[PDB]
Amino acid sequence: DAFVGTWKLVSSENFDDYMKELGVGFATRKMGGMAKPNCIISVNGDVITIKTESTLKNTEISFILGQEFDEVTADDRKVKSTITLDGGVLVQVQKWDGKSTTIKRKREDDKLVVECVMKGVTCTRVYERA
Numbered sequence: 608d609a610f611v612g613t614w615k616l617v618s619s620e621n622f623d624d625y626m627k628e629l630g631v632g633f634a635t636r637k638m639g640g641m642a643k644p645n646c647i648i649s650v651n652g653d654v655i656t657i658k659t660e661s662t663l664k665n666t667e668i669s670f671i672l673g674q675e676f677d678e679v680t681a682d683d684r685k686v687k688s689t690i691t692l693d694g695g696v697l698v699q700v701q702k703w704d705g706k707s708t709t710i711k712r713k714r715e716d717d718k719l720v721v722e723c724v725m726k727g728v729t730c731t732r733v734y735e736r737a
């Protein structure tokens with residue numbers, strides 16, 4: 608839809624702090640902090656696929672809106688994830704060990720804007736079309 612396409616990371620703010628708040632260790636934060644992923648989003652019927660491709664690590668999720676699924680995150684958390692569409696925004700929550708983080712993806716002008724919240728830390732990652 609509005610989200611479908613191949614997107615390339617152009618900016619990131621507070622990603623190291625966001626990863627620290629998740630409990631991510633130094634080596635993995637060093638890898639993630641300097642990654643400039645592509646995000647490839649596609650839809651086939653009820654199923655949406657989001658691939659994140661980067662030099663040192665790829666991940667992929669496929670999901671139906673409002674249906675919880677198991678996810679292994681890039682930092683190796685085993686989480687229960689639910690993604691919904693709310694006022695044009697894809698809202699993802701990941702739940703594990705009584706904690707949660709939210710990842711919201713929204714389209715603004717030319718950009719795909721990704722807001723990641725963990726406790727008091729808010730990170731903003733912006734992608735543009737490849």
Ligand SMILES: Cc1csc(-c2c(NC(=O)C3=C(C(=O)O)CCCC3)sc3c2CCC(F)(F)C3)n1
Pocket residue numbers: 626629631635636638639640642644646659661662663664665680681682710721723732
């Ligand atoms: C939590 C955590 C630890 S590490 C890591 C992570 C990447 N996270 C992303 O891109 C993320 C988003 C996005 O912008 O799509 C939005 C959601 C949040 C997370 S990308 C990438 C790594 C490490 C390995 C790598 F090879 F460096 C490449 N996420």
